[PDB]
Symmetry: C3
Subunit: 336 residues, 3 copies
């Protein structure tokens, strides 16, 4: 009656992937909400596996390299994340989905690396306003949260500078294993690489012309045609329109409505193949108090959908009956 | 040229159906707006029939019974409402629609009861994020605004505790006479009853997959196949997304857009069978000043649509002409 | 690779077309944004042609005439605008689109007049919540921004009072050359004239039932069947929902989403016939600081789309390569 009867929860408070302080508070924004309560009420046993501690070096230990900011903090954090995620997914080897709350999106290199160690044939559904696939020398910002996929994609490795501390970050994805939904702010070099290597992608223009139902179907067709593969769902909260998720560092107008976001998560959940979902780029230090509440609320609804919550309702585990209590009903009285 | 040339307006400031003070100010939020002016400008004669005075007992006179809060205030108020609504609909027996502004949604038991006395074969279109069909012993809150339909539905009467003061509240609806649109927060026991008794329902998931045009058509097909029946349109303002109706007590993200709400009302109005429309759960004491204005504005647009306002425009009652005023036009001058 | 490789930019700070001070700051709201930077980054050469100075007479020199407010300021401003626009379009005779930022919508009489002098067979796509086609004696407000099209439409000239200072304002449009998208607040006499003279129009009701993709196709079919005609795109920011463009003087709920607005502009741009786009009714003096930022942001996204910005990405002008820098890649290292 439930596709997933248990799940794990993990916080990853990355904040060295981008300059705005506050993504480290993402996991707590969700712990402080009613998310856990709501999940239990649907009958799912959710275990809080705690937080990963990111490695945050000082400036002297972690100077710019190839224009990257905090690259050694990134490589060390990536390996720590991957080890923990691999551990969790293998103890789990009705499957047990891992729910990850960030943290800026640079965490994805580690979560996918570790996940792929447990499930080498996985596919990735990347829900984001951005491509997050800049190679280091094409990045205008040097911000790691804009590069996480590039280190993972085999076809891109002639464009990644070699670094000794990156050796353990082994590319584990083929371009054919990734699909994007929600794109609306690609850098020119990302567009070039995505098209050159045939990465499946559905931008907001595609969502407008095709409708979200067809986009979801086509994205799943592209990377998981017969639902044979485990799914890594990487959901950047900034994929959603700023009107519903204002508290995030790189907001872009004209995004997915909450309902469109829910449909993506509902369909992914219903495949029975949801293996990891991560939710990135929440920043409770951005915007007004009401902004933060709106963002928290959207995130909670999204994560609930991923775990199988149905907007059309759920049936009670036990159906209550008046007579059992020794109470007289209207119908009964009307007989007398 | 108009489907309805006159209408009645009635306030019902119920506030004992739920804990948040302020729904009693709903009717005044609409009187203070330009609603009456706008309706007259479309050529409709709208008569303000005043307010019903709810019965509000003190705690000593109205203790909890079967976990219900303010249940005797409810039964007495229900009967007072029904008497007044029946009176209005029978003096009205181009039909004359009654527009009712609440007030929390507990008023619906009385409005439908009285309406059905005048028109026994009516159907109900219930636009709401919530089912409002909890039976008393399944209600977690004890709030009457979450139970109004259960006392009316014949099939549910073996689940309603008998109470002497409820005797005059006679179930007047079959499950086959009700259709929901907009649902997204059903309690488990509501889901059970709705499915068990075959109540037609279209949740936000249905709206997403089918589109609002198909949902409206299917809802009308389910309960009013050949437009033979009078329609009771019960519209909870919280059916609309919180972004357009923030000032309401149980807001739920991912609701109907204003345009989707307008389409429901436009199609219902155009059947020629709109007999009662009630608008529930406005609370001007919730949210910011701008929040209240947004909510007031949405409500006004909704009610105008119900009465036949057309977004594609209306023709003038008398067409003005330059010559009649003894004024020289450009065209005329250009001849000389 | 680009449909338009250069464009001109012109400010028109009209504020005598309506009573609310602040539309004169519209052009500066756009100059202060990153619009110019973003346009250059797409490879378009955009030349700032400065501002037109409106003629603003004092009350004594410009009394009401036929109920019109500031009508002589309007006629003189109209002729000044037309002269400048004609000049620009003829020096331009890959075409070079002119981008105009207002300023209240009364400027349209002049921009279209001047544009038509350069391109007599043009068509007009009018994106607006309002018809802006009231003739003077039917206008309840006397506000010129509600009348700009009436002076231009040949079929309406028997309803325009003759005024000596209006002689040079020659009607240059047939009713068959105009299509509206986005309408939701037509005055009765506008509805009469639009229907009587067969002006193509798609209201928000049409957008709801047909979808924006079909509306755009039908609007272009109506006035530019084989893409033979130059297009004058007149975009009132109030066509967009108040949730995304709050800072404007006559806001109406239930408007186009930003995405729907983008689709209109993308399709118009892609015809290769975009000759003038004007963006009207920005008022930075209305609403909160965040309101103004939202409005500025929507306007920038809209104007970028008009010039050919693609949400699905653009290719780099030069593709960067690691080796050129004498840098060692991961792929290369892995061979050694
Ligand atoms: N995660 C936001 C990424 C923004 C930009 N593409 C970058 O590379 O920084
Ligand atoms: N009207 C809101 C109802 C919320 C909940 N279903 C309840 O029974 O109270
Ligand atoms: N531009 C807003 C126009 C509003 C009204 N139709 C008028 O004629 O003033
Ligand atoms: Mn992003
Ligand atoms: Mn991202
Ligand atoms: Mn409700
Ligand atoms: Mn309700
Ligand atoms: Mn307008
Ligand atoms: Mn306008």
């Amino acid at each position: 009656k439930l596709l997933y009867t248990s799940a794990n929860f993990l916080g990853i408070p990355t904040n060295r992937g981008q300059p705005k302080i506050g993504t480290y508070q993402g996991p707590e924004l969700i712990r402080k909400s009613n998310f856990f309560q709501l999940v239990a009420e649907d009958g799912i046993q959710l275990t809080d596996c705690g937080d990963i501690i990111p490695v945050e070096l000082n400036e002297a230990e972690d100077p710019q390299r190839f224009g990257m900011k905090w690259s050694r903090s990134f490589s060390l954090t990536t390996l720590r994340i991957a080890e923990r995620v691999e551990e969790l997914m293998k103890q789990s080897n009705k499957s047990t989905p891992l729910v990850i709350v960030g943290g800026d999106h640079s965490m994805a290199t580690g979560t996918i690396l570790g996940h792929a160690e447990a499930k080498p044939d996985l596919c990735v559904l990347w829900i984001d306003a951005h491509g997050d696939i800049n190679t280091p020398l094409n990045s205008a910002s040097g911000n790691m949260h804009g590069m996480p996929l590039s280190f993972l994609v085999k076809e891109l490795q002639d464009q990644i500078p070699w670094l000794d501390d990156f050796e353990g970050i082994k590319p584990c994805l083929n371009a054919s294993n990734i699909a994007y939904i929600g794109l609306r702010d690609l850098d020119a070099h990302e567009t070039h690489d995505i098209r050159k290597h045939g990465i499946a992608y559905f931008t907001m223009l595609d969502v407008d012309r095709m409708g979200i139902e067809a986009v979801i179907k086509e994205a799943l067709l592209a990377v998981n045609p017969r639902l044979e593969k485990a799914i890594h769902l990487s959901f950047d909260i900034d994929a959603l329109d700023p009107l519903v998720a204002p508290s995030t560092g790189t907001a872009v107008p004209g995004g997915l409505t909450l309902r469109e976001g829910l449909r993506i998560c509902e369909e992914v959940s219903a495949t029975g193949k949801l293996s990891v979902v991560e939710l990135a780029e929440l920043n409770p230090l951005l915007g007004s108090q009401e902004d933060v509440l709106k963002t928290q609320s959207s995130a909670v609804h999204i994560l609930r959908a991923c775990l199988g919550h149905c907007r059309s309702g759920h049936l009670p585990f036990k159906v209550r009956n008046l007579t059992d209590q020794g109470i007289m009903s209207r119908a009964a009285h009307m007989q007398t």
